[model samples]
Target: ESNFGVDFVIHYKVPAAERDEAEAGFVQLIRALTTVGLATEVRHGENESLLVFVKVASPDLFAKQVYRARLGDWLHGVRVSAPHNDIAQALQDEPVVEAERLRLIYLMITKPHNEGGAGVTPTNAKWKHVESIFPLHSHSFNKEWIKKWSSKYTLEQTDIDNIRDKFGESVAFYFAFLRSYFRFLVIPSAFGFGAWLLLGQFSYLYALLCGLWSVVFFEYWKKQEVDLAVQWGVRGVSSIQQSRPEFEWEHEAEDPITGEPVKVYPPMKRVKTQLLQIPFALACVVALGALIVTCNSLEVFINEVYSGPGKQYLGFLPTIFLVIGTPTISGVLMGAAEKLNAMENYATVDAHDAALIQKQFVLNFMTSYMALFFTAFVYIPFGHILHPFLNFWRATAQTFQINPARISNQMFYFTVTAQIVNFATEVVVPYIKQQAFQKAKEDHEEEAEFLQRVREECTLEEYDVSGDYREMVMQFGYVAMFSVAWPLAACCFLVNNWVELRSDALKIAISSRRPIPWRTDSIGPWLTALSFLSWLGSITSSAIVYLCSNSPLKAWGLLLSILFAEHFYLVVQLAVRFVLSKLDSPGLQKERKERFQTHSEKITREALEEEARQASIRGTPEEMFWQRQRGMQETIEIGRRMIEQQLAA
Candidate 1:
């Protein structure tokens, strides 16, 4: 009853100044909606914008669209068979899942007319005034789901399945991966308790145990991801890449296997711009690196070297930038990354975002890890080599005395203090920002409850599943790389993830709009970042322990220890990978079964089309809502009138 059965909204920013052109744009937009067999409604919005609503003109139109969705999905190798032309017959066993319905409708709105859609988009100059196109939230389901999760500590496989049906596979995978990763963290935290009681600081034994856990978890998820992908029938999702709205390509060629036309950009032409990453990454280092090294040294000067005189002021100067400066500096490079990313002309949304998010790694390296690198690689190794650096500061600190516990402080700050900042920034800041312009949510008429809430939601931004990914992968990096520094970091981070899991849900409910159901099989480039972090985790723990411990090893001792662990990690990774491959289990069994069935079975929609149990249909809110505006000409005339009156106003 609460959600009055609208599907999606397109917010059009109306400019009355375009009296001649605005009506032209408005007419064409209605025509496009008509072309796609979608009903439309025009509503007044704040800031003089117009909200254009879209729903299927009839059940048959959507039924055919969903049939086409899966038929094409099969043609693109969704690890499924083609559907029958008979729409009702093809949906034999499973009914259309919630987001699956929205998913195809979205494709209708966003997909080009040649590709079975309206062809209206941000990239089309004609649709320039269209600000956003988004689906409405199923808030009742969402709120109940969040309440259930809040009350329970553990999420069942049943819950993840529910998320899969409601939200689609990408979000579903995140929940599982997160839930899976959280469960795995138990060993380390439990192991950490033992280390804290028994082993003490810079414990090589803890490093040894933790490093093994890192590799084991990485390999295990490798197996787990495959199982889930196959079970969900989203295997080999790489080929399902969608075209970017403004994508330009050199030529069109027929696919050798999929029997579809493929756009081609010359490999070498793309390769030329791809080469810029080397210098771009290095420049990021130089820019962020220079700022970091300066601030770190200044921090050292004030904290340990100076030991007096305007201490708070001088110390805060270093803190101000180190705390505030890194992200600010990185933001400029992020913009540069995009400019160059667009130059690569990926011609697909997945590829474009894949390259862009990977480039984000460049920023994370300098901004997130540089200080820790400065301390472990430089400060601890060659403090005496920096006696002259202290002498350079000696113009400032003639009687400088260095603190023995500086590394301890640095590690502590990163694990605990930094996390507090992260929690506030991610969870609290979003809610606070919304409060700035939050209007009184007063009711209007019969449409008050549903449309009002939707209008409010219209202002909220789309959720980024990728952002959650980077955030978690980064946290995983800390656990793998530096958790040995403070043995209790695992215990602390364990609790944080527990809260993080729930707080992430709170974020979607409170601050963000319902996410568009984007499908993906694998966690794509994230696996690379995880395995890389795991490898570095091994090497860094070995290095951090040597530098911080009381063993009194020589200069040569430290380098060889780092060198030793690097080689050791390579061997362990190789051995672990080899063993996992040789051993077989559930996912492997499932994969083999799928391949066996692929050749054997010839399922037919024609055979099933004759089967019984046709319509005992209910004419519900969904049908009633679409019936609001019957045909294209009706919607066009009203939209034309809408333009004239608002222009007159």
Candidate 2:
């Protein structure tokens, strides 16, 4: 095999000014690798760059060790002892190539020191220059797979397995989940669109069906996620994750059960920092709430009570303020949210990301939807009572009648124009920007060529799509929470998601650097958020229907009807969840039983083999000595018999 096939490369780039420091760090890195038994060779790279090539002493042995470790991972309590002579021969006989061997070595190198790795993470304080750690690409293999993927009608188990083999399990699982979710959403979206046409806006039947569908989708997704997690062998994987190199700790101690050293942080400190978020969150809610209320009040006055000069201009001011201020306020609060997250000092990167996402979700939810909330619940319903307040400007005794049509009009804007605008701003704008950038580069091709060479020498690591994931989650929130106001909201959202799926895939595959694959069992807290939004949609839809109706009722009567509707909706959701769970996978019980039995058998075999090994070792010398003694006695008896026969003759 060629050196590229058997070795992995780590590139380090040093600025012209910081060349000395970078060289020192590179030497330190080499020393560290040598200490951990990894052989490294250095070479010059593009412009002022350094490349370190790492190779194991024996690729076959390394591959065997990795196989054993994986076996141990799969079968807990199945001790993988050092292979005996015959087993070692069998391992050598197994089919494997240089690429697979290097992949095994890479896996080991990325793990923690306790897990038999060199512990050289790419983006740590000590080795920040170590840009990328990837093996040479197998172009022919990748091309073949791409061709196979294009011809396939649907993604299958074999496709997932091939992806896992090429990339990591983490990447494979994501594709698996996306494919499954895409297939599932088609049914609900089709039904939802049909309902949209059949039942008008805020129809009770439509709302209930949508709500129940949301609940069922969430439950079914939960089960599907678990099944995929198990299939990918990543269930409960968080427990074994290595700590972030930048993580701060109050103390360090060994785990009693696993006997691995673990860093300990003060939970009380985290708790105290987390408590600060409550007040901060409340402040955000109040600020956003007040702004929205003020804007709506201004709009109501401009359209109704204002008979002043520049009335048309005045009407536009509130909308302009909302359009400009929303993102500004959201941006400022998001900065504060980042600071709070840093104050929390979570040990894992995942924990930090989760916290940040939560804060962002809250900020986005309040800022994005608060105006709609005011229009739907407060402005439309209580406008008559509040019209007297608008008299401060005009001093009119007559109350201004509120237009209920405005609510429907605003919902229509949200459902149609907002989505199109978002697509334009978010996707199309970026594409244009990137295209412009590429054109600019092409204009300065010679200069860009040198830079491109340098970029090629650098490693790609740690790219994230969490921000995009959050955006999609919020979009889903919009559909579930307010689809009642616009019957075609689900249809619009469904189309957006289809495009989003492809766009996101392209971004991951071509635009961004390869991210370090991380395993997750589910899509985090978004599932729960969807469920809550569905339930809230039921209440909101019912209220909107009641308000739009011409019937006059007491306050108690409205409350009782809303309560009755919410309860009825909740009951229907529960029933739908149960029925769907039953119908989705009829063989789940049998599958679980078979899986349990297989696991039990593996553990039992491991135990019995361990006992047999002990017994053979204990009986070895005793049995050998007794066998020699019996042989000597037999020889003596044979000699005695021969001598007696000779004397008789």
Candidate 3:
């Protein structure tokens, strides 16, 4: 597993009954990799599934790819230092880190041959039988580092550096965000504790503090990500955009600004299409929301009304309604988002996914949160006003009773139970089985450890960082929007996140296959989600507090509190932005210092701060570099003379 380790494992699905043409697909894959000149092998997996195992066949190819990307880094102004003149000298001088080396190799593997990769699997039903091509988990790396974390309170910057060294920036960035957010939680956690014992459950003080905390967290994170991006030397990486293989180009035209030939498409039409598509999403909300409410109303009947025999068996109806019907419908909506994203023709995967996750986050929000929102915003405070909604479900079901304490209880279940549900199951049995297999294997043989481990790893699922983000972002929504009902909600998050920080490490190391280590300077679409949640939190908190408090509930007074809190939240948001903009964090100062001291002006044309600025009346040598030949008139006369001279002679 050390030298010549498998770069990744690609599972080739051999479907039952259609076993005849299976090898045809297998040959296409193997020959495909063969043409690309990658190391390819086959191994039998579960139930006749064959894994087309792959790796960088030759270091010669990989080493050069690394060099090319380094040169790309230098050329594109990402490098603070210049590349060594010789490829030999480059390795001798600074040396490549494991993360950087593997990252570009993965890059080479992912991109199409036209873009310098084989793209072994194309995007279609043609590759439907090809399950996935996922990477090796560095058990050696994680096993050791995770040992140190066993008794530690906090992680060092070096730990982050180590993750970046191994797992790459994208995963490392997630850990850093979790760690940052966890550390940030201390203020609110302490404040929540103080309020829980010292103040009432529905205290306005806690509500304001919660709103302020949300905005500060967002603004500070907004400022902080740039610092990390710069610190990690990943600030200016947008130039290297990947071409969407499926993009339908209108024509090749010179870039309006850069003068390079680029594939052109109707950018405005894509927007027009997106605007047209917006109605469909809103329509989904209505149709999906109606179903969601109908299902939830049934759940209410099971929870509050049904007190007879077999109530527990029938209780599963709403849960099943959500588990199947909701996701299936939303799954179609997801396909819709992906289809439109393809048409949007974003030049990069990140661009496409950002668009994807934005749509995804909202879909998830509606499906899950709509039920809860109905409970908090509409149903609880104004009961019979929602009675008609129940009627739409009913003109049916036994009569029900609403528990005064049910809303709070539901919040707790969602907060803690969902966290456990999301994290606990994924990690629990996997580790038990993981250790069992390891122990079983250890006594049996020695060399088989590596072989057995990888094969089992192949069976394990790919790491879902997107779902992980949703988990945290969703929790944040809980604390921000619904915490007034439970003043110590921040306390629960603090404990959960502490476990979360460790649980995910175990999840990554022991349970799932290693994530495809992608590069990301910022958590995309997450910022937007948080901002929306916080503002909604502010408004939702205001309404809930006024609606539920001992103070007599009046609609006019309720409206005032909502508007007042909204104003308060915006003012604090503006104040935080203004103050933070004026004052740089320590990380920001370090980046500024590097930029001040960094002078990377070079012979490379990409180093040009301004090209046309140098095209003066007298003319520049660089201008001549772009067009060194004589003007059209000089060539015109020379050709004329040549024709005459040839004719005379």
Candidate 4:
């Protein structure tokens, strides 16, 4: 943990054309690092890969080693993946959880198992441990899960579902809240009523309240996300990302001091290219807004003056078209987001995932929120005001029929109701469905795998305990219930949480995946997004209410305001991040330094005691020499001294 950064030296080979030399250098670098007790690991990249890892003990030392290596080589032609294949192999050698077991299985299938590898299928032991180490992905976010759900009722992996259930009532509450939120859309009518009773349509008081509500809601969600994340034991889990498997590099070099290998890339050029996100963001906004505006304009036209006979059914046409078209436009926008993310070439998974999720947040906000805004504020409000007036004209035209409907009141109610309903239907219901499907899916997979294993000539009696069937079922119930029902659904959750923690631990020890001993430096990036969304929602919701109060112009203006506010919040957040980083740096440095100091002290004490014991036991020079030889066996320094002594004798 001490500053070992100075050890790495970058030595670049002459010809970029001879990749074989660099590759061989990589092997040589591994050998050098390991000989000194450093672990290594590999990661893949598009053209090169990243090696994320440790060298000996201190990350600081590794950094210095890298800097020295960078200076030693003409790394302009070499590509560096920053892949710490050595470190990952070591970490995986012994794991703590069933998930780790599965991951080991997968690893053994790819690499060798006995010596610490996945050993992936192709050889005899290949398929043996392959399926055992599948990392769990959130079914909520996974594209495959989404696809399967979109087509039909799909299943989730079992162990993961149990893990999700462990995520508990908080997760369920989240979906429930979303549903309630969709329903909350209708509650704006009450606000509108309050507005009507107190300030009328032009009341500044109304706008003020809406603004406060927006800000308050946003603030609250931030804390809520943090609390939920802590409960899930993923509060700071993100630091474990191995380098991307797909990495590319320009050249490889070795540090003169550490003899460690380093990769090089054109840092400046890549940094410059990453600036494309600004234009890319603007393009997303424009494209999404255009789509919304186009749909709104068409809806207004069809509703106001279109003499079309099929107008009754035609009302759904615009909503249907927009619904169908929005996801397509969103997909393209997200592709751009991906490309933007890829171009940036972030150094860590946390950073990379953050950037990627940010891109997604932007697209999500632009498309989903904007569509909602246009409907609630632009289409509904303005159409109501202008439509009756247009209908007034239609009455004069004998060819057209206009239904004179006072739409504002109705629109307000529906908007609020729809929001809450949408929340429940879109968030809660689906989450439950997915969880159930996942549970069932996992059960099937486990059973299938079990049967297959049994067929391979295993004795169930060897592993069987005296538990009854009822007890086994009860254990699963305990696993499922602890996460979803008690704390999530009841006010007693805070209390039950404590007892459940111990109970769950019991179950885990007896039934669940042997907890995989994993190390991480931070929480996954999605937690950040979740926090952001909570904040963003407040402002977005308030803006919706404000804009929905009147004209499209006002609505658009409010929309812009929301965007500005979001940007401002982000700026504030960035500043806060700087302060926190600065604050935490010293503490982290102290902790690492203290650990090394303590270890060194312990080692020195042990060495002193050993020397004293040896001194007391050895009564003569010859005896001492024999004892010393045994103590210093394979020791170069001792051997050199012994040769000199022999010459003198």
Candidate 5:
């Protein structure tokens, strides 16, 4: 042994039948692992005995390390390998035991993270080292959470219709916004500009154009939404995410008619809870909206519109109070939403996430418009009513007759103006702010902590740019600009999404934890919310137009138009869903058919085998009965032929 190495080989005969061919495969596997530096090995079985001479840097040390590695797979009552004990038989055992040792080693390498198996299995073993090994994201607890409400909501026609209503809202809102938003701003501006050219600000044409613009915008938005719904595959698809594991089934039975497995539960509980929520939510809406509307209107009326005493900046007080109290009320509603989510017991995280987000969206919508409405309508025009009323109460006499007709135009301008400004802020300002903040924050401890977090989320290898300047610059672009900015800002986002797609792979190749394969089909909860926003946008746009149309038309017009549109949209959505469902029903039937075919095939084969086995048992005896006389003839024919040939030779 030139390098202070020693080696030995042992030999034994294994039965041909008993020694599985897979043992040879395992040997090849071990040899490969050795060649790859995962193990060290030599073979001594030239012909007689198959002996694997494993030469390790430290054989006992390797055993100890492997033993300690068992803890990684031992959670949640899953079994782990037995800790290494100083057993003499274990060190040198029978061939069967030796083979088992190899299997144990293989099993350790293959278990998946969630299943207490590495998940390498047989096929994926090559890439196991590449995938960042980590525990699975916990949807198990989420599954547990959904179990509570799983049975309460019946999937009745009415319930299905309600879900379809939600879907319709999603479709309608998105399209409506796309149309209303473009028309409300663009059409008025277009018509107003033409009117401006012709009438030179002296005609009633601009006002007429604005009014026509508002009406057409609302009408077009309504129709456009219906068209868009037809285009998107998910339109009228009432998708509820998988139930949380907590969703308990009251009973499950094979359906008498469809033969489909049906889960049944009482439905009144959900209806009762849902009914109760309306009052609570309405109460919240009224209280929060009233508070915001009152505070906002008062502050604006007295400060800007009214000439009041020593109270120019004091007007900000009401706004300030509104700001602080609004979030407090919102926070309470958010808590209620959480309670609702808990009560609903949705089957999947996405469903619960959707439901909760919708509730939050509602609360946000209430607060947003409540403030907006008061600022534009009450503060500007109706300030004559509130401000003078306040002044007279304060013993300062004032009287001013306001043109209620002008209030409508003022509200429209505010709404349209705010939307444009918001768009710019959302797209451009945030992108610029993020870039500046990231650059500045880099020198701070926060940057260090952030990098540390990235390293943890990713992997050890991903911790590149670690004190390297060039790498930092590269990673900075990859992380901040590429990940967030590119997706949100671009005009043709889908066209260039492919570029953004592989950037994460680039990050993984350079940075930390080998990028683990996770699963998602769509953008998930955000998609649902986006759909909801579409429906909301259409309804809101139409109502706002009507509300700001002019004079007595404002209030009554808004209420009638919005309510009718909502119910109409709901009915149309139900119709669409019904037709589409019927058309799409047969797709999944193949799977059921195949399952039945397989089952029938299995039954037929089993019957054939049983019949053959029984026939063989009976035939053996009957053949024996005839065999005594025919025995020598049958047996000796072949033997005698051989003997006769031998004698003749």
Candidate 6:
């Protein structure tokens, strides 16, 4: 299995009822496959299936060529010194038959005819059933790699590159993103820590700096994500991807640009489905708003209005309700989101993922901040004004009142205490459960290895970390939104993220199955959420400052101050972006320019080579020169034959 000789087996089944006709069709399929340079042999498979063992005539060389072609595609727009020499050395440095080799062959078989594939529709063919297509798995090889990766102290660039080599670029880019973001956070986080100690909580200066930091960090990460995607050779990769199996199409038509036949779905129909999200989103907001109001009312009533001996016990009610209701509401929302996404009729998996993320963010954002939103805007700002209106039982109660300090205390618990709980729940709880399950399984020593193997394979189920990623962003939102009252919030986040990054890596490596590699240019949809958070943070932070300060502003003055502060924050953000752009590293520009020049040269060389080939095919002077003697010999033969005929007469 050293990849010097690699082969794959595709198990296909024809319905037993039409075995004769299917057998003849299978023979014809083999002929078509052989014409495309594939060597195939058919045999019996499990349960009356036909197993097609596929191989290339020169598998070793073919695998090398596949690797070279991928390298060439990646290097297409890149500028480098001596590309041929570099490519040659790279080709020789590794096993030609690797995971990537198998992946390429899989694509070669599965791609459409126009895309140079055999166009075998696995599992869903009308007459032929492609039951399974799998490479010859080397159990030892997989085990060795897993052990090697898991034992590493730290993942480096080379580690990510190896991941890309074995898995796909999409998976590798995620690690790359984490690696970059973790490092980038250190600067702002450290600075925010110092601001916390010196300026104290709710300092206008600290809020301003932190708000700016959030916006700048989010924007800068955008650029970094793109740079990594380009470096990884996966930019705009979605464009070339085949349609998802679950994807539905109304009709088939030719691509206007490529003139290749494609499945078509009406974009307008999808648009109409997308518009349904507007009403759905509004409904979510209203529902969540009502729930938060109910909880807040109960809490306020228990804490401030109720002077009974059991008030402390009753205070737990709102928290209890929240713990139960949040998940229930969130689950309901998610189900709705899924149905909406399916109704949208996305033509590709990426589109579906994008739509789901959008809907998910809406729910997640509300769940994360709905309570905080109430406290900051509704409860704190209008509590005194609204307190008198809730006097239905005026005979028993003399007064009801609440202070901004209570809101501050709640923010404190949310940022500091709740986060600690979250860490335990997300990281510690799962690890403990995994360990317990692992130990229980190990008790059966005889079947341990087999069980482990099956478990590992099952773990290879696709890991969807988008939710985890969104959770991290929401944590950042908390800091941005309430860090004015808790200057150390950013510092807390910085620490959490440091551990979260490593913990997440460990989870992906140990707990989850290896993820299917995917390519993305930027963090989807969350960018908009982060930007909105920053803008909202500026307004909310300013309002909190105006109200909570010693010189608490009146109603109109506070509103005007918040408006001015928002405008000011926007201007400062714009200025920061401009400065960052102006100061971008010059090396990046030079590299891009050289790449452009190199690509231009490649295009020119190919055009000239094609023209020369075309010219040689015609009766050009050079062509005639080579055939002149042959032409003369033919004419001499004809003349001699005529002379012999005349003499005979």
Query: What's the TM for model 1?
Result: 0.83
lDDT of 4 by residue, 387-494 (tens): 454454456565633221212332333233333443444345555764674596332553443323222211111111111111222222221111111111121222
Q: For candidate 6, lDDT tens digit of each residue in 1-649?
A: 2322335666667778988888877876676466446778665454466666677775554555565556544565332333343244555654443455666666666655665566565633432556455554445545665566557644577777766666566556556656665565566567667766786555677667767777777767777766666665455554544476657787999999999878888888888878898898888889878777766666766676668786755654675557544655777888888888877887677778877888888888888788877787777656764454345334346554457655566665566555665666667777898788679753256644443343333433345677676776677677677777766666777677666656665656555654434445556666787788888888887677776663444889788868877887888888878877776554467567867987675665566566567876764776445334333455587679889997988
Tell me the TM-score of each prediction against the true structure. 0.83, 0.73, 0.76, 0.41, 0.36, 0.70
Write out the backbone clash pairs for model 2. none
lDDT of 5 at 501: 22
TM-score, prediction 6: 0.70
Query: What C-alpha lDDT does candidate 3 achieve relative to the native structure?
Result: 0.72
Best candidate per lDDT, number? Answer: 1
The parts of candidate 4 lying over 4 Å away from their true place are 1-97, 100-235, 239-241, 253-264, 307-316, 339-344, 373-649
The regions of model 6 sitting more than 4 angstroms off are 1-90, 93-106, 118-167, 184-200, 236-242, 256-258, 305-328, 384-399, 416-421, 432-452, 550-552, 584-649
Residue 599 alpha-carbon offset, candidate 3, angstroms: 34
Model 5 Cα lDDT, one tens digit per residue, 1-649: 0111212111222335645553564454454444322333333232233333223344554454344433322331121224335432343431212212333343333444443223333323433122322221112322332342244321222322222232223322322342234224444445444543564321233433333333343334434443433332222233323324345457777899889765554567656766766887788778876676556545545654556675644655665455435545656777887787677645455666556665665665565446545544455334554554455434543334443333333333333343344334333454566467459643155344433333233323422211121211222222111111111111122212222222222232222232122112222343344344334433543443344334345456657866765565555555554554454333235435645776675565566566656767766666445434332345578678889899997
Q: How many Å off is the CA of 199 in candidate 6?
A: 3.6
For model 5, the stretches where C-alpha displacement exceeds 4 angstroms are 1-265, 300-332, 347-358, 372-399, 403-649
In model 1, what are the clashing residue pairs, if there are any?
391-394
lDDT against the true structure, per candidate, is: 0.76, 0.64, 0.72, 0.41, 0.40, 0.65
Note each model's CA RMSD in angstroms.
Answer: 21.5, 13.2, 13.6, 21.5, 23.7, 15.3
Worst 10 residues of 4 by lDDT: 457-466
For model 3, how does the per-residue alpha-carbon lDDT over 45-84 read when each residue is reduced to its tens digit?
6656876668877877777787777778798777667665
Better of 1 and 6 by TM-score: 1
Best-fitting candidate, measured by TM-score? Answer: 1
